[PDB]
Each structure stands twice: as C-alpha cells, then as structure tokens.
Amino acid sequence: CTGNQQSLAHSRLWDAVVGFLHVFAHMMMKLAQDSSQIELLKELLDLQKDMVVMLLSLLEGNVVNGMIARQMVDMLVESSSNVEMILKPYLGRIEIMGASRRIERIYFEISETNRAQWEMPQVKESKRQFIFDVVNEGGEAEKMELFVSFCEDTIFEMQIAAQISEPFWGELEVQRVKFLNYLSRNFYTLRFLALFLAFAINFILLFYKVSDSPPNMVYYFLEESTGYMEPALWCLSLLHTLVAFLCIIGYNCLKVPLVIFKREKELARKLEFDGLYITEQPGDDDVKGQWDRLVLNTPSFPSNYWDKFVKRKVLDKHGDIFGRERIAELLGMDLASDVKYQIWKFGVIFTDNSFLYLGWYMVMSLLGHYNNFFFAAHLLDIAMGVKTLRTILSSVTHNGKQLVMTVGLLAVVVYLYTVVAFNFFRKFYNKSEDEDEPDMKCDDMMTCYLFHMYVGVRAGGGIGDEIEDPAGDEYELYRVVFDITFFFFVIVILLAIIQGLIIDAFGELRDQQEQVKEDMETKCFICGIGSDYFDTTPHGFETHTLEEHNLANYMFFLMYLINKDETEHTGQESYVWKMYQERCWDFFPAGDCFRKQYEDQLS
Amino acid sequence: DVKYQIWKFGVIFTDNSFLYLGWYMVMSLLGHYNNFFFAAHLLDIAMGVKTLRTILSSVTHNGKQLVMTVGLLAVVVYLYTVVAFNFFRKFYNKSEDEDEPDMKCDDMMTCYLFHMYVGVRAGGGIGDEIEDPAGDEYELYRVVFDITFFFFVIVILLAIIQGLIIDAFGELRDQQEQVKEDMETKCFICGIGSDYFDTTPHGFETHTLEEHNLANYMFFLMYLINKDETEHTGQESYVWKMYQERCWDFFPAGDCFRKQYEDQLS
Numbered sequence A: 001c002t003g004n005q006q007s008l009a010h011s012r013l014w015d016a017v018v019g020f021l022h023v024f025a026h027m028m029m030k031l032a033q034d035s036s037q038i039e040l041l042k043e044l045l046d047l048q049k050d051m052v053v054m055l056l057s058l059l060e061g062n063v064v065n066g067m068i069a070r071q072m073v074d075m076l077v078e079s080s081s082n083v084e085m086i087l088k089p090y091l092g093r094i095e096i097m098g099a100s101r102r103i104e105r106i107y108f109e110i111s112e113t114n115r116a117q118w119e120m121p122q123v124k125e126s127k128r129q130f131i132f133d134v135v136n137e138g139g140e141a142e143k144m145e146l147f148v149s150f151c152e153d154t155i156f157e158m159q160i161a162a163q164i165s166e167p168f169w170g171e172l173e174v175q176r177v178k179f180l181n182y183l184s185r186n187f188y189t190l191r192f193l194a195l196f197l198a199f200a201i202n203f204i205l206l207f208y209k210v211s212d213s214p215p216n217m218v219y220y221f222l223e224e225s226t227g228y229m230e231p232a233l234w235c236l237s238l239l240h241t242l243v244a245f246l247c248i249i250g251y252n253c254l255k256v257p258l259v260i261f262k263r264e265k266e267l268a269r270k271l272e273f274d275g276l277y278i279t280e281q282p283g284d285d286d287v288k289g290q291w292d293r294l295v296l297n298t299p300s301f302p303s304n305y306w307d308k309f310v311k312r313k314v315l316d317k318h319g320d321i322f323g324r325e326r327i328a329e330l331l332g333m334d335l336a337s338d339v340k341y342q343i344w345k346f347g348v349i350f351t352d353n354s355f356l357y358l359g360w361y362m363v364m365s366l367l368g369h370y371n372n373f374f375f376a377a378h379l380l381d382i383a384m385g386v387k388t389l390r391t392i393l394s395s396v397t398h399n400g401k402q403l404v405m406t407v408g409l410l411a412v413v414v415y416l417y418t419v420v421a422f423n424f425f426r427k428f429y430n431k432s433e434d435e436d437e438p439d440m441k442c443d444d445m446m447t448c449y450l451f452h453m454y455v456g457v458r459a460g461g462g463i464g465d466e467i468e469d470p471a472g473d474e475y476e477l478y479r480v481v482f483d484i485t486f487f488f489f490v491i492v493i494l495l496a497i498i499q500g501l502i503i504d505a506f507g508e509l510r511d512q513q514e515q516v517k518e519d520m521e522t523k524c525f526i527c528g529i530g531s532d533y534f535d536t537t538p539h540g541f542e543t544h545t546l547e548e549h550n551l552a553n554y555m556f557f558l559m560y561l562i563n564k565d566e567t568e569h570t571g572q573e574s575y576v577w578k579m580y581q582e583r584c585w586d587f588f589p590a591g592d593c594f595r596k597q598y599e600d601q602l603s
Numbered sequence B: 001d002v003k004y005q006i007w008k009f010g011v012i013f014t015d016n017s018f019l020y021l022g023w024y025m026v027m028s029l030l031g032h033y034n035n036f037f038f039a040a041h042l043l044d045i046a047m048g049v050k051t052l053r054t055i056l057s058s059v060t061h062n063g064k065q066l067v068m069t070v071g072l073l074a075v076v077v078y079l080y081t082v083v084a085f086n087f088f089r090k091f092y093n094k095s096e097d098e099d100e101p102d103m104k105c106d107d108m109m110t111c112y113l114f115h116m117y118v119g120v121r122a123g124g125g126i127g128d129e130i131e132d133p134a135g136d137e138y139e140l141y142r143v144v145f146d147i148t149f150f151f152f153v154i155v156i157l158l159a160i161i162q163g164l165i166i167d168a169f170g171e172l173r174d175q176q177e178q179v180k181e182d183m184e185t186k187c188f189i190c191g192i193g194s195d196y197f198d199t200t201p202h203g204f205e206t207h208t209l210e211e212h213n214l215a216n217y218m219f220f221l222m223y224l225i226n227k228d229e230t231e232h233t234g235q236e237s238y239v240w241k242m243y244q245e246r247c248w249d250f251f252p253a254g255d256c257f258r259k260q261y262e263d264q265l266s
C-alpha cells in the first residue's frame, strides 16, 4: 500500500529500528559464550527474523532513487559496525509487471536440491527439446502458456525424482519401496542393459546352422567349437526377459506419473476455463474426452495434480448460473459434506506410445523363447535408443508422406507403361530361351505389371535390358522410344526425386536448428527485446539473459510459489499466485525490462 | 637436467604432427625392405595440398554419421538375412551343377556374408543374385522381400550417404560465408556494426584499418613484451599491468574514439 510505506518511512521507525542491531550484535555475542543462554539466543534469532522480513516488506514495489531506497542506505551507514558484527548462488532474481503496470524485481530463495536437479543432463535435454519446439513451431500469443506448462512438468519431474532418490507385512512395504526406487533410478541403465543383451543374443545366433540330420524334417541347432555358446544363449535369454520386465516396471514407476499428471492437468483446465463437459460435451470423436468422462465422479480425480481444490473452483465457476445438484452429480461430490479411477488410469496408460512399445518389446522377448530368432526384432531398438541414429533417421521420416506419394506415383506410371507394353509389346517379354516352354511374362495384366514393377524398377537400365532386343523389327522405332522414356522418367527422375527429398530433409533439419539457435542468441526469451539494445554496455545481453530474465529463475520462482504455504505469501508473491490461478500471463514482461524503464536513473 | 629433457621429449612424442613425420620416416625405412612400401607415401597428398584437404573435409565432417549409417546398414541387412534364412533358404543356390549344390544361406554367418557382400554391392539388391521365385509358393513373399531390400538398403540407405556428403559441402560453404559476413559487417575489437561507421565515406574501412586494427594490437603487445619494463610510460605500464593479471578490460568493447567524441569531431 503506497500510503503505508510512505507513512512508515516518514516516521520514527528508523530511529527505533536502530535499537536492536546494537542489541542483536552485542547481546548475541554475550549470550553465545554461555551455553545456558541458547533459548534466549533462539528468541533473538526469530526476533531478528521478523525484523528482517519487515525490512524486506518495506522494500516492496521499490523505485530506483526512491525515498525509501535512499533512506535505507542512510540507516545502514549509521549502524554499519553493528551490521558487520551481526553478519559474522541461491538468490533468484526475476522481473514482473506488477499491479502498478511498472516493472518490479523479485528476490527469493532457491534450494540446493532444485538447482542440482535443474543441472541434471535429462532436464537439460528436456529444456533443449522444449526450446526447439517453441522456437521452431510456436506462437507468440501462446508461448507463455507453453512455457508455464513446461515449468509445471519440470517441477513434477523434480518432485518424483526427489521422491525416488535413495540416500511379515512390515518388511514387505520397505522391501517393495526400496526395490521400486532402485528400478526407477536405473531405468536407462536397464534399457542399455537390454540393448547390450540384444546384441549378445544376436551375436550368439550368428553361429547357427541347419541340417536334416540330428545335431524332410528340419532341425534348428546351434553349431560351434567352444561348446559354451548354448548355456550363454539360454542364460542370456532368461536374463533378457527379466530385464525387459524390470524395464516395464521402472517405466510404470517413473514415467507414468508424468502422463497421469499431464492428463489430469489438461482435464482440470478444460473443466475450469473451458467448460468442456459443462457446455461443449464432445459427441464421439474426442475419444480422449470420452475416456476422461469416467474419472470426473471419482473421489480422487486429481491424485497427481496439485490442484485438490479444482472441484470447488469449477463449482464456484459454473454452478451459480448452471446449477448445483447437476454439478455435484457430475463431479461425484456431496454438497452437504476406487475401481473406476484405476480403470481410467490403466486406460490412459495403455494408450501411451512408450508403454505400448515397451509392452511390444516384452512380447517379443517372451516369444524369443518359442523361437530364438524372434530376438532379432530387438535390434530395431537401436533406432529408438541412440540419439545419432534418431537424427539420421529423422531425415528419412521428415518427408514420409512425400516418399509414400512418390512411390505411389512410381506405381501409377509403371502401370501406364505396363498398359502400353501389354497392348503393343507382348512379343518381346519372353524370359525362356527354350522353344519347348515359351514363358510369356506379358500375356496377363497382373503378370506384366508384376514383371514391370519388379525388374524394370529394380534394374539399372529399366526394361530394355530385361526383354528382347527390338533390333530388326517393325516396332523398333517405337520400342527405342518406349525403353528410353521408361529409363528417363522412372529410373532417373523418379529415383532422383527420392534422393532430393532426403537431401532437402537434411537441409531443412539443419537450417531449422540454425534458425532456432540464431533466434535464441539474438532475442530474449521472456521479453523479446533484441540483443542490439542490451549490447550498449559490455556483455549486456549475457548479463540480461543470465540474471535479469533467466527462464530457469522463472521456473524456480514458480516452484517456490507452489511449495510455499499460501498464507505466508508476500504482496508480489500473492499477486503472482493469483494471476497463476486465473491463468493470466500478463506479469511476464513483454517488450519491457527493468533497465529499459530506468535508463535515465541507471545512466 | 635429465627430468626436463624427459618431459620435453614426452610432450614431443604426444604431438600428432611429429608422430606423422615419424610414421613417414618408418615407412621410408621399410621401403628399402620392400619397395612397394613407398606407395603409402602417396597418402601424404591428403595432408599436403590445401585443395585435397578441403575436398576431404566434406567426407570427414560427418564421419560419425557415416559410421553410424554403415552400422545401420549392417543391422538392417542382418534383419533381412534373418528373414531370408528362416524362409528363403532354397533360392540361394550359386552352383548350377547338381553334383555340388552350393547353398549360401544354410548358415547364419555364410548368409550374412553373402548378403552384406553381394546384396549391397549389387545394383538391384539381392533379387538379382539369387534364384528367380517365379512359379513358386513364396513368389508373392519374395517379390515383397527383394523390393523392400532394394528400396530400403540400395536406394535410401545409399542416398543417405550422398545426402550427408552434400550437406557437408553446403555446411562448410555457408560457414565460410557466415565468417566472411560477420567479419565485414562488424568490428573485431569493439563489435560496433559497419552501419554506424558508414555515415562518413569509407568510415568502416578507415576504422578497421587504422583505429581498431588487430595487427596494431598484436604489434603493441609485442612492443610491450620486448621493451624494458622500467621505460614503460603511463599507458604502457597500465596495459602491462593489466596483462599481468590477465584482465582484458582495456580492449574497447562497444565503444570507440569517434563514438565518444562525435560532438567534437562533427
């Protein structure tokens, strides 16, 4: 409140402020020596804690060269010795647009665990993927919503990672929790172990031979000299199945909670700020909404989302105009005041692509015992495991639609050439030199089309190198046109199109990466002001991005708000929390910053 | 000083260029044992000529990607070997003589070797190296097998290598263009763009060649090094001291003489 701050500043508080620092230093040093004064020491401790929080509260909505700011340093000078005597990386600085439409700076506290989790390599990879996704294909209007959602996902990741971190019914729970946390910690280690076991099993299978005689009926036996390969194969297969099972369990205990949290978050936001099942009521096409209908009335709908008051919020949002009893029936809440939820959660899990892939890996691992060569399908995991192979195959899969369409075009044009050759060139397609059994491969539309699509596309010269030479014939001049047109159009152009598509995919991915990097290094992520503005002072842009508008600082502040009790929020903290509740991202500085507003005072 | 000499020789023996020259000497010595060992000295054209270095830089720019795509080729050919071995053993008869039937897919190692060699080294894949499946139960499966082999291995998995090389050429070329553009649009020392200096005619050229010439900075640093410290002037002593503590604040960053004194100069 502007009035109260200036009333306190223009009073005798500051004279009374220096009545304690003298005490807070000398009396503390007096009481520290005697071990019997610990309780009085702690009383003075929380007394000065209240004092310092009051002083911080006085510096709320501060303006550079303001009356309160200039008055504080005077008091600091008058009692400097007491400050030095009382005194004898974690600070988080962000800038918001406060209720006064003026940029303000907020300082808070960051714990060591949060920073350590932020510097973890997997969190770094998630941040890089999010940055690329937003910069490449994103909108400026919805950039802040995506950023806040990513921050929420990162905070939930931090929470579950901290939960799983490790520093007859009684022992059962302890052993089960320890086992599950051990699996969750080493999910990627188990994935790599499964991949290595796949290579080992395939290498063992590389020593296979087949014979009619025991190691017509065919016997499937592995032949080698050492004699130790079959016990190794047996043990490795029974170990690989167990490893795949452990991988699925670790995925369930590690990555499923993120999916459940995201689903509950989107459902709660749709219920509150959209009225999906209140107004929209999707008919049949939104299968996601159709399956989400079953969780509305569950007693524990927001189990993972930290929004337990979502039912009350949606009630206050809609019931006053829409009705009270129907909302209670829909949400399954008693106004006076869990098989279905488990079914919904399992249905959500079974829709997830990664869980399905792990289930398919387990299925093939099980079937590998029926036939050992089913373990060869696990080498496909190298595509989804290694980043380099993913980036290489991204060039192929970037233009998958175009590749399919050009294959269809190849099929159509070869069908046209088949029609022409079948109607005019049936004689030449004699693949048998024996006059006893003339083998015509173009006396049938299906056979001629198969012959064309197979050999004329699989050959280097087209179809003129697979059929009879038309020299010394009536249709020689027509056949030389036919074969050469086939060559030029199908073999040359219609197979250079595929190579051009792949090369253009490589180029597009490379220039997308370059564009994302250039945009990141030339503009600020939060405010969008270009680096040319900040480069007036030396290292201005670097300092701005790393300290003033660090997105990591914004994530840390949002986590700080989430894990802090709402009753203890300060003015700016309460304002930002309220703006969070209504999902208004106006407090993010857009086009403005602290130094831009106060250039005159800073220069 | 035996220990210092030992350390110096250990440092020398780690250097790549000295090792390359030692290997050249070793092959030169062995060429007397067998004259054809002198053929390995033609590899020196790669490390000698600048043009060959630039040409081979396109190949070596994506060496990791090329190795990884060769490994992917090996894996996919192994998969096709597994399928053909479990279902297409009959067709891999490379001997027409009935007396000695030569099956090249009755063994996993032999079939994998046959695939990796001829099916990748042939223009049509593996359908042009084995028996024609016409008039057979598995004809419709074999035509899918050979054509998938062709499309995936021969076409796509060898166009990936060409695309990698072409993208390497493009990346090197655009890197050179970007370096040139950055050099000609901004000052190396202060970073102020050429648009500021271009108000006066030839302003950027004069600025770079005289006011903020990096050659002049190197000459000044050499002048400080070879001059006696007792004879340093005020600015010389200040710059020498800043050199001692490795503080590069004296380099003008974002500021220059004309920018500060525009009012007096204009």
Ligand SMILES: Nc1ncnc2c1ncn2[C@@H]1O[C@H](COP(=O)(O)OP(=O)(O)OP(O)(O)=S)[C@@H](O)[C@H]1O
Pocket: A124, A520, A521, A523, A524, A525, A526, A541, A542, A545, A546, A549, A550, A551, A552
């Ligand atoms: N709000 C922002 N927070 C952080 N970096 C920003 C921001 N806006 C722009 N940038 C720029 O983003 C660039 C890359 O971000 P960095 O913080 O350097 O992280 P990084 O280099 O991508 O990867 P690491 O391993 O975390 S250092 C920097 O050069 C910053 O100048």
Ligand SMILES: Nc1ncnc2c1ncn2[C@@H]1O[C@H](COP(=O)(O)OP(=O)(O)OP(O)(O)=S)[C@@H](O)[C@H]1O
Pocket: B183, B184, B186, B187, B188, B189, B204, B205, B208, B209, B212, B213, B214, B215
């Ligand atoms: N501090 C700097 N010193 C020299 N050139 C600079 C500097 N800052 C920017 N440049 C620009 O760098 C460009 C290339 O440098 P030049 O001095 O012209 O040398 P060069 O053309 O690369 O090769 P040569 O053979 O030495 S002329 C020029 O167009 C300058 O404008």
Ligand SMILES: [Zn+2]
Pocket: A524, A525, A526, A527, A528, A529, A544, A549, A593
């Ligand atoms: Zn900014």
Ligand SMILES: [Zn+2]
Pocket: B187, B188, B189, B190, B191, B192, B207, B212, B256
């Ligand atoms: Zn300059």
